[PDB]
Design a protein around this ligand. Structure first.
Ligand SMILES: [Fe+3]
Ligand SMILES: [Fe+3]
Ligand SMILES: [Fe+3]
Ligand SMILES: [Fe+3]
Ligand SMILES: [Fe+3]
Ligand SMILES: [Fe+3]
Ligand SMILES: [Fe+3]
Lengths: 83, 82, 78, 80, 78, 80, 80, 80, 79, 80
């Protein structure tokens, strides 16, 4: 019940939406290499790229809330930081 | 890892229509479960784009081995049901 | 009128399509004729069901304006 | 397989799927108050019932024996 | 009267059929005859159980008028 | 040489399925007020119990060693 | 219900859970040839088996009857 | 594979798993009044967030297109 | 066939032990019987012993126990 | 409960989930041969192991008895 309506409910829900978008992109990535039709493959790459933009959009929202966005700012330094 | 023109192509696209609509229902539930405006905006945006994804997969099954002859008497047989 | 009605009809579309896929998997799992033929009949009827639920959800509140530009988005790729 | 461990078990599962679909449509008749939705739910449920009965006719004269469904209406009779 | 009793009995039919499917899958994975015999016995009893549930759900609520015209729709494809 | 994870484990699964069926039907006796449903539920549930007992007696002789279910009556009695 | 579907359902679930754990440890015994794993997995399997037998005696003193689980040793030989 | 099938899809799945862990730990933050547990939970949740950020930058620095990380900040402001 | 065939399996066995303890505890806290409570708490104690045993097994195996030497200090290192 | 099932069982679940994360990354080490992936996966797996150790002492440095985890090194040695 103690939920500021906006500061803690939709955050778990939008992380869920990120997960769902990512799984959908995974399925379309599995399906690009599963036929030799060219138009179907093309429309699948289009929908896959659009879902990819969805994932980026939900990610950029999920960063700018009460969770810590400095972790997704210290990521470019921590990537190369492994030797 | 597998290639077939009939089921390995059609069954998967029928599944994809289900997946698009699952996303649509989930998004519609997320529109009606908060009062955020940024979240509402990005959710209705993503929801409308999946609505295009679902319509496109519906044309894929139409322009596939399945028959778009079901979608020619459907507007009348809905009306043929009262 | 909403999830009470719309989410349930989306779900019924999933169920119809799942029945078509399952019966198609059972048709491509034999080379008989009795099961194949009557399963083709049940498959055809399931497909009609899915089309019917699709026209209903179009003729309800939601925006089927994607199913008006779907014929143009199919044609637009060659 | 294809008749022993496959087809009949798979067709039993097909009957199972028809029963589940009808269960969903019957729950959906009384979970809204629309008339168009009510009409098409009853219509699709009727056709599903046709599907389930016909799959039952297949399983009767398929590998399983249609002698069990016939010596059961009297075992029901055991309720008064 | 609805999904709590009748649909639940349809669920019971589902459970009977799945139990028969599992026991039949277990009969076709060995040639030990003692297990095969008791498994086939239990399966025959499950089969009568499932038939019993089917005739009850015919009487409880939904219409078995398809289950009177089912041999009639079976015959139409030969 | 599989009578272990091809014969015995399968019977553990069969006991699991029987017990789950008994639990499901017992939930179905406690979810309505009908007599006919009561009659068929009590009949089929008792027969399922018989099935579970049959599978248990099968698993006793198949593989595992029943040194516990002969020494078990003392561990219940060990208090109260 | 409580004693019928809170007491009995819970202990049948306990038997099922014991069976699931035993099946998992048995699958892991035949999925390696290590000696530490074999020894400790067989030990844990022995203790789970003890747990399962004890849960079975618990359900004996509940809603199921040994009127079938005492006629199971007599009914096994008469089935082939 | 090790570039497309098993590499890009797998890293997206790992991102999903880390996000599920973050959501779970946030649920455990809102279900207690312990402060040592709260502290370790916000620390581990932050570390999972660090994992999610790292996996996101890798999947960007992989085959997939990081052009969304140039477009999304403009397409979000465009939403009212 | 030495790491992910066995180590994931031993972690899974630990998972089963943990779920068994949680389920047993939920069934101990669902009645006011003492025979069932006592023997179920006993079985839970053996489940705890099992989880402990598998944990010591995984320590002398492929994963790194370098966390279990400074973990008592990083636990306290939070105030 | 705030201490029994709302706190303790949740921590049992959290340890289970951390083991799941390490297991998934261990499955992913056996599904590719890239070096960027190996580096970041080893980092996140090492951090997950740290998480699991932290939750293990939290459940240990609680009211339940870490006395099984004080005589474990002796009872395994009792296994051959
Ligand atoms: Fe999307
Ligand atoms: Fe989608
Ligand atoms: Fe249908
Ligand atoms: Fe049965
Ligand atoms: Fe049964
Ligand atoms: Fe155990
Ligand atoms: Fe146990």
């Amino acid at each position: 019940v103690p939920r500021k309506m906006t500061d803690t409910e939709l955050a778990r829900s939008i992380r869920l939406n990120i997960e769902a978008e990512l799984d959908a992109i995974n399925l379309y990535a599995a399906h690009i290499d599963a036929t030799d039709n060219e138009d179907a493959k093309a429309i699948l790459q289009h929908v896959m790229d659009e879902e990819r933009e969805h994932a980026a959009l939900f990610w950029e929202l999920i960063a700018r809330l009460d969770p810590e966005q400095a972790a997704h700012a210290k990521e470019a330094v921590e990537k190369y930081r492994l030797i």
